[PDB]
Design a protein around this ligand. Structure first.
Ligand SMILES: Cc1cc2nc3c(=O)[nH]c(=O)nc-3n(C[C@H](O)[C@H](O)[C@H](O)COP(=O)(O)OP(=O)(O)OC[C@H]3O[C@@H](n4cnc5c(N)ncnc54)[C@H](O)[C@@H]3O)c2cc1C
Ligand SMILES: Cc1cc2nc3c(=O)[nH]c(=O)nc-3n(C[C@H](O)[C@H](O)[C@H](O)COP(=O)(O)OP(=O)(O)OC[C@H]3O[C@@H](n4cnc5c(N)ncnc54)[C@H](O)[C@@H]3O)c2cc1C
Ligand SMILES: CC(=O)CSCCS(=O)(=O)O
Ligand SMILES: CC(=O)CSCCS(=O)(=O)O
Lengths: 522, 522
């Protein structure tokens, strides 16, 4: 069943409703056909996948005046982020931060008693499921009515050759193909991995039909594992993380990483490094009852009825690589040159499909650049020197070099941080700003107010790296990184206008030291 | 009683304790004398006041190799901000934001029933009083041990002439004086203004010995009035704001202002424009019982036992002007040229003492620029095109021109905002990020997820203004403003690396429109 929506103009909320209906449809739902029947031009590019990369790539290509076509197996545009990736992740992280606050000040002011309070994980996941069609509605609307895009949703794409694709029972031709099918959840090849009670970011928001027990086991040690792990811990459950190597290796500054790990442990999280799951035990009904793993100190068994796999995402290259004969990398990523061109003529690859970094900025930009190249604008794209972030119970932002990294690299440096290095350590009222004021003023909670630092080259006076743990600096790192790439110095940072009290105190702290020709750490 | 602390080296926490002791000492406390009695150099400048302007100016002067002396009547450095201004303001705004969240989701998830819950204002003020010495301790420690500053605290400065100052019973000479005594609370010339129950930012944290009733009257529409007003409202009290002119004029963009005001009213706040208090009624016990004011709709009477004055701060220029013969402005501000020089030879004026804008960046920067001039470096300072912000129950950030302002300036423009202007209005799941996810997904709460907009010149493609209501963008505005002053275009904005989900969605949204030669609003 195909629905020609081309001449239909549903509102954001109407789209939200129609999408929900199609998703919960037993037959699978009708195909959303939004194609221009009067355009004589041949598609400059057909996007296989309409997620972050595909949608943005199409938006830009269309803006340039070219013709595009999106084909996605989901009845909505936007991809994984709004359905099971970044959006739910941020809802969960919001809860983790709010819950850490409530537990810290339990039984104080307007804060209820959290002593034996266990928050429902399913209730929050259900909250997400109940409102995720909202964002999906905005995407279908914005893409059609505002971005003037053509698309076919709720129907998998069928790639015949580098110029032909079958969709909605029809066959389409294009000058180029832009592969943007993203990546899928990583898994384990251990007994019990298919048991009821084992989840990943994708299945968690589709198959959680019970409320997890008191203990949760998380497998992995990077972003996803830590973000979801802190949320589970925040709901009041004993959370054990089994990390194959070492956790949070993305945090290069040693002190910053230590602060983050220390605060996670203070919240009760257990992180076991060098551990490898060997078996997920099933009970008589096929449900998880425990996790067995090998560690540096021997085998261990953790009783649990809920296991979350937070492993790296894997590029969905298999099918396309076989159909087109694409050259692949060691992790299955599709190989491409600086112009996003694969080994197959007129075939580009973007987003998570081409590997790391697997972030939205990389997906959207690669999608746009591939589009520009398809339109004749030869432009290279090699992601490098970008800001990054992750959530624990705090927002953790970082860019550039860590302190030890800079000194080992041959850079004479000075650092400016908060709190200062003294015998009182973290037990002081700074750093402090929006969302950390209660920690800064509470009895025995000052050490929880945050940690931040900038690394500066003592000779060039340029900022080499910035690190922040707390809240409200993430957005700033987007803009600060650009200034740093321009050659930002401690003097220029000190000359800015701060908005006190600020999440990052970099501006004024730089000003305190910038008056000297021979910089000194603070 | 003078304590020579020069060769003593207290830790941050020992300083916190010592300062508290001196502040609570019945006799007034001992003088804190930190002077290098062995240094034979003349003082380049004596700073009258060691607040934001005096402390930063001293730090910069010392960094440049000059010699300085700070004299302050309080036993700590840092001024009003940590004792009764910005720091408590932020603790209160943090509470206001958390309380709106709790009230919005009352009885939902882990949130307790807030239906009939009135938070204790005195409890929060007491929390502030109990922990404010922490920041004070850091300031005394940082200034002495890290910034190598000389200072005399807990002693009023007694200026003799433009080169001589008395402090701690000793007479000091200097090449220049830098006046940095700030400003004091503004008051009303009406009957009953001195009744018990009438407070300003300063007296609120020193004399609140009772818990306010169910109604609070706030006089003024300034940032402070609005910030404290929303906090009082958040505690569960009927809050009436008596604004002299138009509410929130600082927010130039009409749409942004409307959103902010509408959200305040949704929380139950009553905002009265063009109102002037005529009398504060006292009961037989000498306590405020009602406020009477004239408004565009006639005289009104509001019963209350707690009134908060959020009027403009007044420069502390009287005594210094009499002694030195300083030229003053109509509001009592000390007049200075662009080098921060007063009408008196070798005497500079900085911070709130020289008038608006009364902000920390202005205080600190003016202090440093005066210091540089004292050290022989001719440098002018004229605050202009700076970012700004204020708190309601949300963080409100703004810079540059509002939409209407831009068109009146002759610019042909386009705008990029969230949420989109459609039939569904604000009732959609965008904008969304950290701390707005629950609002975005909650039943009927989507409209509370925020509002944001950038104003762009259609021809030059340059960003002319940025506006945001939500959380986590404040810090970013510090850096974004610098980029905008450099001539940021929509294309350059789109070329940045975003950190999704981001408080400001400006980067990716700009990218969605940047591909066209003829820009169209989103
Ligand atoms: C738990 C989690 C949290 C994350 N948090 C963040 C974060 O905070 N910030 C950030 O920047 N990044 C985050 N990411 C990563 C980010 O989600 C991805 O990098 C980005 O979504 C990838 O976009 P893409 O366009 O390459 O793929 P996707 O957006 O995943 O979309 C691929 C699209 O192709 C479609 N498709 C697949 N196969 C076919 C087929 N055969 N036929 C038709 N359509 C097909 C899909 O249905 C989908 O719409 C997170 C990821 C995870 C897993
Ligand atoms: C309620 C409130 C909230 C605010 N919130 C913000 C905000 O969020 N962000 C922002 O940027 N700005 C904010 N401000 C404004 C900011 O507090 C001021 O602009 C800044 O503190 C002024 O610094 P200053 O150095 O000029 O004066 P101050 O820092 O106030 O210090 C003047 C100093 O001089 C001393 N002094 C006075 N008389 C004498 C004397 N005779 N002898 C010796 N010492 C003397 C004082 O004891 C004091 O230490 C706020 C103000 C108020 C009132
Ligand atoms: C409304 C929504 O889907 C938020 S998740 C971002 C999807 S996209 O703009 O990167 O396609
Ligand atoms: C620690 C503290 O006082 C925070 S308030 C800022 C005071 S100053 O650095 O502007 O002097």
């Amino acid at each position: 069943k195909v629905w020609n929506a081309r001449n239909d103009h549903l509102t954001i909320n109407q789209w939200a409703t129609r999408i929900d209906e199609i998703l919960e449809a037993p037959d699978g739902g009708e195909v959303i056909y939004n194609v221009d029947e009067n355009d004589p031009r041949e598609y400059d590019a057909i996007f296989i996948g309409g997620g972050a990369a595909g949608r943005f790539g199409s938006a830009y290509l269309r803006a340039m005046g070219g013709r595009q076509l999106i084909v996605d197996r989901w009845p909505f545009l936007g991809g994984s982020c709004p359905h099971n990736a970044c959006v739910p992740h941020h809802l969960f992280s919001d809860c983790a931060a709010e819950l850490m606050l409530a537990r810290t000040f339990s039984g104080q002011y307007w804060f209820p008693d959290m002593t034996e309070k266990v928050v429902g994980i399913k209730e929050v996941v259900d909250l997400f499921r109940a409102g995720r069609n909202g964002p999906h509605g905005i995407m279908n609307f914005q893409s059609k009515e505002q971005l003037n895009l053509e698309y076919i949703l709720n129907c998998p794409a069928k790639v015949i050759d580098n110029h032909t694709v079958e969709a909605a029972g029809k066959v389409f031709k294009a000058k180029n193909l832009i592969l943007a099918v993203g990546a899928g959840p990583g898994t384990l090849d251990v007994p019990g991995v298919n048991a009821k009670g084992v989840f990943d970011h994708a299945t968690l928001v589709e198959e959680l039909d019970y409320e997890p027990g008191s203990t949760v086991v998380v497998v992995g040690g990077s972003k996803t594992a830590v973000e979801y792990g802190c949320f589970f811990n925040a709901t009041g459950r004993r959370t054990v993380m089994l990390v194959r190597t070492e956790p949070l290796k993305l945090i290069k500054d040693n002190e910053t990483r230590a602060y983050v790990l220390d605060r996670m442990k203070e919240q009760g999280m257990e992180i076991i490094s060098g551990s490898n799951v060997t078996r997920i035990e099933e009970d008589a009904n096929g449900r998880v009852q425990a996790v067995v793993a090998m560690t540096p100190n021997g085998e261990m068994r953790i009783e649990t009825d809920f296991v979350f796999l937070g492993l790296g995402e894997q590029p969905r290259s298999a099918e396309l690589a076989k159909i087109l004969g694409l050259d692949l990398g060691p992790k299955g990523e599709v190989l491409v040159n600086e112009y996003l061109q694969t080994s197959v003529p007129n075939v580009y690859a973007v987003g998570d499909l081409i590997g790391g970094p697997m972030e939205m900025f990389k997906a959207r930009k690669s999608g746009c650049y591939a589009a520009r190249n398809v339109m004749g604008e030869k432009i290279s794209y090699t992601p490098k020197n970008y800001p990054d972030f992750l959530h624990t119970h705090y927002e953790v932002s970082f860019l550039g070099m860590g302190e030890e990294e800079a000194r080992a690299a041959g850079h004479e440096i000075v650092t400016i941080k908060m709190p200062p290095d003294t015998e009182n350590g973290l037990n002081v009222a700074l750093p402090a700003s929006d969302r950390t004021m209660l920690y800064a003023f509470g009895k025995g909670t000052a050490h929880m107010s945050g940690f931040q630092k900038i690394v500066i080259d003592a000779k060039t006076r340029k900022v080499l790296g910035a690190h922040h743990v707390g809240y409200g600096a993430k957005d700033a790192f987007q803009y600060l990184n650009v200034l740093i790439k321009q050659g930002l110095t401690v003097d220029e940072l000190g000359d800015m206008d701060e908005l006190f009290l600020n999440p990052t105190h970099f501006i004024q702290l730089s000003r305190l030291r910038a008056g000297s020709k021979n910089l000194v750490s603070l």
